[PDB]
Design a protein around this ligand. Structure first.
Ligand SMILES: Nc1ncnc2c1ncn2[C@@H]1O[C@H](COP(=O)(O)OP(=O)(O)OP(=O)(O)O)[C@@H](O)[C@H]1O
Ligand SMILES: Nc1ncnc2c1ncn2[C@@H]1O[C@H](COP(=O)(O)OP(=O)(O)O)[C@@H](O)[C@H]1O
Ligand SMILES: Nc1ncnc2c1ncn2[C@@H]1O[C@H](COP(=O)(O)OP(=O)(O)O)[C@@H](O)[C@H]1O
Ligand SMILES: [Mg+2]
Ligand SMILES: [Mg+2]
Ligand SMILES: [Mg+2]
Lengths: 471, 52, 502, 187, 468
């Protein structure tokens, strides 16, 4: 032990310590003595006369002034390796699932630097997940970065637990789920949704996922560092082993928002609407360690809460640059029963390109989006003129556009407890062919209720015969 | 409802009579205070003994 | 009288060395205390006159302290003592049927509560291993709630809306309606209740104990009360104390329920209490951790696994919003902690839908769909027949006539809309609900008039409880509405419709 | 920078900045018990209708209050490290708080052998046979090689007891115990 | 002479004062020696090392530092009793009617606590007033608080001059009026209208009303404490005499507007739009004493101001939890001419209930809000498109809800001098009967200019008889 300081001022969750002999640098870890639980404080400022300003990682009850504080000599050191699979872990790297300890032979301090310019893999690919809005309109990429926007209650824990089913079971590489401040109820489903589905095995060593869980019943200094315990386990699988990883994080807005809860208690003047003045700096320190270098790859899927459906808020609008692919869920669409809620005219990918996805995939998805923006100019006419005043060409537009809008919906497999339907998984070659024909006119003779919640286009004519027999 | 309300009006007056009469009875004594001081010394003599 | 003399011989006059800090200032509730070396944070300190307080800030020179009471008996130069305990309230079943203040002293006057165990107001929510999913139902007796927006046991559900729309009445029909299970026989269908009154005048809380005592509802609840006259550190401490009496039940086997009325008045008691401690303001002068204030509260509402006891703790937070705007600061921070919501409006209340529930927007993560088996049959089809209605029934100006095409479907909604209305402080049962909902969806009401369905309901309901008591006992016992049970009900509605209006 | 000796009081404010820079500087070279004798002689020449006429005057000059005290602090008795300190306070603008520092250095130097006295608060005073016990049974508590001190203040609102405060201890035995009979009226 | 103090600092109406021994406890009174008038300082804080910070009741100009200050020993006390009737007082209880001193046997402090839980009375009744908007849609009680929310220039005091003219005449017990921060010529025309009409008796002891006044010329340490003065003369007439007292307060916003003018200078960080940090604890300590209890009954009527016509402002919108009835007035209503400009959709009660107000009345109540909401929910379409693109059923909730809006405006008794129209009082049973004949559809041939500014329903057919 070195520099056994002493506590002087516990104001909120911001403890200040005073060292007799040895001042520790910024970003270290400190160990408060005499407590039956492990409370870890991380150094953040140097004040003068050998006092530092730390931040606790637990509850600050029972902190009497004049209490000793040890020092470890480094930032927080978590376990890492291959034996961290099928486990749930704390922010300071501890078990929280009551299975015993993590027996690894390698530790990684959670503060590292972004890899340089000359370690940047440049190649793009495609990735097929099975969904007719992802694979048609905002396609993924093997190694890219993927963000799931949208408000509260629009479908982000479902769309992120369906892609865990689709991709992260038919995958050779590994996956990590980091829970940065969400409901502890929802962190009990996914622990049990994947014990029966074989992704976690509680007796042998063939699990393929690792879990990091610090939830919204936690003090707001520990809800800023489970975003970094995630991509330290998800970097040993990319750098050290030459493997391929998948990164699942829900929710990453609670990393930013838990930095605004201790800004003024640290001693800063608050910026615009209430955020800390280091928004785009502490964020970009983290969102550059999630990259694919020339030693491995990372495919990252992060859920991004938009507060009060306000996309121009500074916490989401500074995240639109750290990402290759955006899938923006709206709420005015999921009120029409359409599920997945994904906005067709607001999602966007980089590889939507006539030289990677082909010049048939490209001509389709730029005619779906062009007929849906043609719809909205007619909806302002219908509100005054009524439907039976329009011409015969514009009536053909609204009918196909409502056929396309209903065909973008698809029953997921995880809606087998909510809706009672059966799940689909559409291949890419059928997705392009089905949408190509509704634009042509080869299904102009059907009712719209056939197209709601089907898979391939051949199931959308096997419904229009059952509706006509039961008539 | 008459039996209970006349008990409540009587109860508060009975308390204040014992309370307001003890103020003058404790004030008048002058010999027992010297008795009261030596036990106050002996309590403090007993008090520091159990600490160390 | 023998009672005063026996109270004075039981009194213990114990004396010991305290640990003591001289006061340096007293203004508006905050007492910066010189001294107090070994004090903890969140410790309870005790002034000389009988007051009580909690030392929040620690600092090298002074020690910030807030008072549970009134700051006019306190003068500069006083004495602050040390208890030696982080702030704790009594707990147990012995508080049942009382009205108590925010530290567990009775304000009803039935005496001292005999309580044995004490539990902190700052304890921790349980994690990921000791929970389980939501298996059971919680019946409110409202018919728009139980059929369309069901609520499981262990699920945080938010009642949100304006002032004077029904937010308190919704959560008091729920208190009344569990009377039928609490005098029954099984110990796993009961539901012990708790009401927390924050920022309310005493001529509403002494009037709600009246409404809860003619119906004999008060024999199974507790009322933790911090009125608008109280100190601002007493309206802050109230939901953390009421939630800690709920976790006597949940951590021992039973099932509890807790209403915070409301939680927009536990925030302005934190904004004031922590501005006079010189803490810098955030948005709307709220502190940094109003999200951490509500989140560390609403995560104790668990549902434990069956190797711990299996008990549950529902929660029903009320939130008042200004001008019906839901995008405010404190609303959106608590929409995203709760599983589902109940959106109460004003134009529903005044057009006539009372309870004024927006059944379009009142979404709910259904709680593993523990509605019940028979209600799934009749309110499964009801949910879709009402959803079909709302897409197509908003013109108010007709020009064309399609009675075979549209006017049949919208005639099924107004018969099911006017069925959904209810009274006040008279909540139904679930098999009395299956009967009245059966007669609406099966076409047995399209030959009435909609101005007579509220009259049709009570004449129907009195006929089935009187003449058909052994019918409804096979729905409640067997769970489902069987095919032979479908047979017997087919005559009763038509026999009554043959002689309803005559 | 360097580490410094910890004063056993550690006060704060504009006093304890300068009143610890003096304690740390004089504890080097073991100039501790000497310097209090010199700080009590500037503690008399400060109160003078020509010296205090310009030690707190704003409008004389920023510079001439430095040469006038440096000539004054050296010639009469002493040239220790206090002659730099009076030159340090005057160079900064803290001449107004000069009596504060020596009242702060005195309470910091007193605890090196002192007690922070108790305060017996009872009544009209007492005889020798009951006071020399309380000047000796109050020594049985501390037990650290020390020579105790005390204050007395008479108050009659305490009707029948004495309160005492050894440091921050407050063992109270008085007529507060009439208010403790609320439990008779408290059901 | 318990203590002697000297003024140390003076900022506006926040005088600082240092004592030497004998610190006064908080909310005592201090007497400034060496002035022509009485200057009383009330202790607010304790700023450390024998120094208090006070708030002054009268003006502080002319004070010098070192000026002596003497300690009273008690809070502001006023003379209370049955001789207070017919007398006008100020914040410290001195006769400002120039008719000589007030000689009572007892004195009452300004600051006292709140009633307990087990001293509350729950019994509700109906106080019929004689106003159609209040009798039908939002009935007042007999023993409950009432608010009259309104902007500037809508009618919150012409409405309060009616509930004196209709309730304080037929009352049997006493009455108390308080003026907090409103203008002084209106506080003079209540003296020369209660002397003429027998309520003030200058010659013997047969007077009914008390008066207490602090207006909009005072320093803001007086407006912040004049409302606790009339609140004390209306508690002796409740607890120690046992009467049934009225209480009229106008205006109660200035208890709070003039409390955020001395809160900046006490050293406090401000909360939202500019108000004090303790906005809603000092209001819940003044309002928690205006109660009906088991020893008497106070029937409050408070006028409340909304700043810049905003109901979400923090000073009006925290008063709502302290009421029983509510009468939100409006500006855009009063641009049409509907006086009393009461918002029928925003006004509530706790006794509107089919078992209390009677099941026939409760159905004309809820059934006339239903037809009023449905006129509001089509104002988007009528304003753009036209009346002429509606159905035939919804040209019959439009023409019937314009006969109902006009039949809520009543000529008042106090407003005869303005417009020259006779003030009408209707009873309760002739409004329920008179709205069922607009809901059932019996008057659908009479125009809408006949339902306007009439009393009982027979004047509507008579006004329709005139125009032909
Ligand atoms: N089921 C119901 N049907 C018709 N009216 C009702 C019903 N429930 C309550 N009300 C009426 O609505 C009014 C407001 O109800 P309630 O007091 O619960 O609203 P609130 O929003 O809780 O009030 P506050 O804003 O003071 O908290 C009351 O007058 C009540 O009588
Ligand atoms: N297939 C589906 N598509 C859209 N929504 C669904 C589907 N199945 C269920 N839902 C409902 O939509 C809600 C979405 O909430 P959820 O995605 O769990 O959390 P979040 O608030 O993070 O979006 C769920 O409560 C669920 O009831
Ligand atoms: N019942 C009424 N009939 C006609 N005019 C009214 C009525 N009530 C108010 N007014 C008009 O509105 C004004 C309201 O001002 P007043 O009520 O005196 O104070 P405030 O500005 O507080 O409302 C009056 O001067 C009067 O001209
Ligand atoms: Mg979610
Ligand atoms: Mg309510
Ligand atoms: Mg006015």
């Amino acid at each position: 032990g070195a520099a056994t300081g002493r506590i002087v001022a516990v104001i909120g969750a911001v403890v200040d310590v005073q060292f007799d002999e040895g001042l520790p640098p910024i970003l270290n870890a400190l160990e408060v003595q005499g407590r039956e639980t492990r409370l870890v404080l991380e150094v953040a400022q140097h004040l003068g006369e050998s006092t530092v300003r730390t931040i606790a990682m637990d509850g600050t009850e029972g902190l009497v002034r004049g209490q000793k504080v040890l020092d470890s000599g480094a930032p927080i050191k978590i376990p890492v390796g291959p034996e961290t699979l099928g486990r749930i872990m704390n922010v300071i790297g501890e078990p929280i699932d009551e299975r015993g300890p993590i027996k690894t032979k390698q530790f990684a301090a959670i503060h590292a630097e972004a890899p340089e310019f000359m370690e940047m893999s440049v190649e793009q690919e495609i990735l097929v997940t099975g969904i007719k809005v992802v694979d048609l309109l905002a396609p993924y990429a093997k190694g890219g970065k993927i963000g799931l926007f949208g408000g509260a209650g629009v479908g982000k824990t479902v769309l992120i637990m369906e892609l865990i089913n689709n991709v992260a079971k038919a995958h050779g590489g590994y996956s990590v789920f980091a829970g940065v401040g969400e409901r502890t109820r929802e962190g009990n489903d996914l622990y049990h949704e994947m014990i029966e589905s074989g992704v976690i095995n509680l007796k042998d060593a063939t699990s393929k996922v690792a879990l990091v869980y610090g939830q919204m019943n936690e003090p707001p200094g520990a809800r800023a560092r489970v975003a970094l315990t995630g991509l330290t386990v998800a970097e040993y699988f990319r750098d050290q082993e030459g493997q391929d990883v998948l990164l699942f994080i829900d929710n990453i807005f609670r990393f930013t928002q838990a930095g605004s809860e201790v800004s003024a208690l640290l001693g800063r003047i608050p910026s615009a609407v209430g955020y800390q003045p280091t928004l785009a700096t502490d964020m970009g320190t983290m969102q550059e360690r999630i990259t694919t270098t020339k030693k491995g790859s990372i495919t990252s899927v992060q859920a991004i809460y938009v507060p009060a459906d306000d996309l121009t808020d500074p916490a989401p609008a500074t995240t639109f640059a750290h990402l290759d692919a955006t899938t923006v869920l709206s709420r005015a669409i999921a009120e029409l029963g359409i599920y997945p809620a994904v906005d067709p005219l607001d999602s966007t990918s980089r590889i939507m390109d006539p030289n990677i996805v082909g010049s048939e995939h490209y001509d389709v998805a730029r005619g779906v989006q062009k007929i849906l923006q043609d719809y909205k100019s007619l909806q302002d006419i219908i509100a005054i003129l009524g439907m039976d005043e329009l011409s015969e060409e514009d009536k053909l537009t609204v009918s196909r556009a409502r056929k396309i809008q209903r065909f973008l919906s698809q029953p997921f497999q995880v809606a087998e407890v909510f809706t009672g339907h059966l799940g689909k998984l559409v291949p890419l070659k059928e997705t392009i062919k089905g949408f190509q024909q509704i634009l042509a006119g080869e299904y102009d003779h059907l009712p719209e209720q056939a197209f709601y919640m089907v898979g391939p286009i051949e199931e959308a004519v096997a419904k229009a015969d059952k509706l006509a027999e039961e008539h | 409802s008459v039996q209970n309300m006349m008990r409540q009006k009587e109860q508060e007056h009975m308390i204040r009579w014992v309370e307001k009469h003890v103020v003058q009875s404790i004030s008048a004594q002058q010999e027992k205070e010297t008795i009261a001081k030596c036990i106050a010394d002996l309590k403090l003599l007993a008090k520091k003994a159990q600490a160390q | 009288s023998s009672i005063l003399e026996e109270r004075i011989l039981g009194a213990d006059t114990s004396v010991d060395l305290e640990e003591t800090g001289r006061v340096l200032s007293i203004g508006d509730g905050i007492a910066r205390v010189h001294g107090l070396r070994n004090v903890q944070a969140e410790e309870m300190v005790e002034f000389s006159s009988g007051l009580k307080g909690m030392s929040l800030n620690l600092e090298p020179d002074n020690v910030g302290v807030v008072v549970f009471g009134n700051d006019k008996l306190i003068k500069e130069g006083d004495i602050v003592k040390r208890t030696g305990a982080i702030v704790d309230v009594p707990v147990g079943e012995e508080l049942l049927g009382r009205v108590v203040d925010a530290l567990g002293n009775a304000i009803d006057g039935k005496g001292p509560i005999g309580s044995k165990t004490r539990r902190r107001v700052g304890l921790k929510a349980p994690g990921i291993i000791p929970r389980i999913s939501v298996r059971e139902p919680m019946q409110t007796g409202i018919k728009a709630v139980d059929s369309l927006v069901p609520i499981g046991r262990g699920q945080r559900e938010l009642i949100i809306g304006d002032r004077q729309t029904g937010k308190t009445s919704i959560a008091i029909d729920t208190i009344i309606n569990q009377k039928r299970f609490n005098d029954g026989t099984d110990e796993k269908k009961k539901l012990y209740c708790i009401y927390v009154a924050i920022g309310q005048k005493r001529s509403t809380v002494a009037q709600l104990v009246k409404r809860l005592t003619d119906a004999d509802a008060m024999k199974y609840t507790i009322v933790v009360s911090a009125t608008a006259s109280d100190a601002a550190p007493l309206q802050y401490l109230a939901p953390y104390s009421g939630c800690s009496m709920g976790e006597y039940f949940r951590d021992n086997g039973k099932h509890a329920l807790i209403i915070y009325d409301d939680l927009s008045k536990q925030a302005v008691a934190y904004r004031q209490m922590s501005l006079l401690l010189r803490r810098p303001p955030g948005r709307e002068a709220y502190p940094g951790d109003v999200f951490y204030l509500h989140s560390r509260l609403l995560e104790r509402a668990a549902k434990m696994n069956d190797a711990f006891g299996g008990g549950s703790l529902t929660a029903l937070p009320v939130i008042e919003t200004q001008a019906g705007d839901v995008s405010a600061y404190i609303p959106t921070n608590v929409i995203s902690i709760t599983d589902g919501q109940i959106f109460l409006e004003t134009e529903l209340f005044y057009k006539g839908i009372r309870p004024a529930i927006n059944v379009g927007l009142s979404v709910s993560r259904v709680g593993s769909a523990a509605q019940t088996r028979a209600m799934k049959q009749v309110a499964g089809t009801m949910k879709l027949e009402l959803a079909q209605y709302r897409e197509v029934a908003a013109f108010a100006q007709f020009g064309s006539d399609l009675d075979a095409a549209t006017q049949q479907l919208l005639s099924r909604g107004v018969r099911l809309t006017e069925l959904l209305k209810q009274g006040q402080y008279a909540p139904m049962a679930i098999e009395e609900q299956v009967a009245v909902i059966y007669a609406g969806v099966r076409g047995y009401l399209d030959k009435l008039e909609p101005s007579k369905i509220t009259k049709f309901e009570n004449a129907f309901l009195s006929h089935v409880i009187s003449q058909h008591q052994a019918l409804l006992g096979k729905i409640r016992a067997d769970g489902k509405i069987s095919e032979e049970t479908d047979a017997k009900l087919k005559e009763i509605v038509t026999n009554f419709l043959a002689g309803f209006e005559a | 920078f360097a580490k410094l000796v910890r004063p056993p009081v550690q006060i704060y404010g504009i006093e304890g900045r300068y009143a610890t820079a003096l304690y740390s500087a004089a504890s080097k070279q073991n100039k501790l018990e000497q310097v209090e004798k010199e700080l009590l002689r500037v503690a008399q020449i400060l109160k003078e209708p020509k010296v205090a006429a310009s030690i707190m005057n704003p409008y004389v000059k920023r510079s001439v209050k430095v040469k006038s005290l440096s000539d004054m602090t050296a010639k009469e008795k002493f040239s220790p490290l206090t002659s730099n300190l009076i030159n340090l306070l005057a160079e900064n603008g803290r001449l107004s708080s000069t009596p504060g520092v020596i009242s702060a250095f005195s309470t910091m130097m007193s605890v090196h052998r002192g007690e922070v006295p108790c305060s017996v608060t009872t009544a009209s005073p007492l005889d020798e046979a009951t006071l020399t016990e309380l000047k000796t049974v109050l020594k049985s508590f501390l037990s650290k090689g020390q020579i105790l001190k005390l204050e007395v203040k008479v108050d009659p609102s305490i009707m029948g007891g004495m309160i005492v405060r050894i440091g921050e201890k407050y063992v109270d035995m008085s007529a507060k115990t009439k208010i403790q009979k609320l439990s008779r009226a408290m059901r």
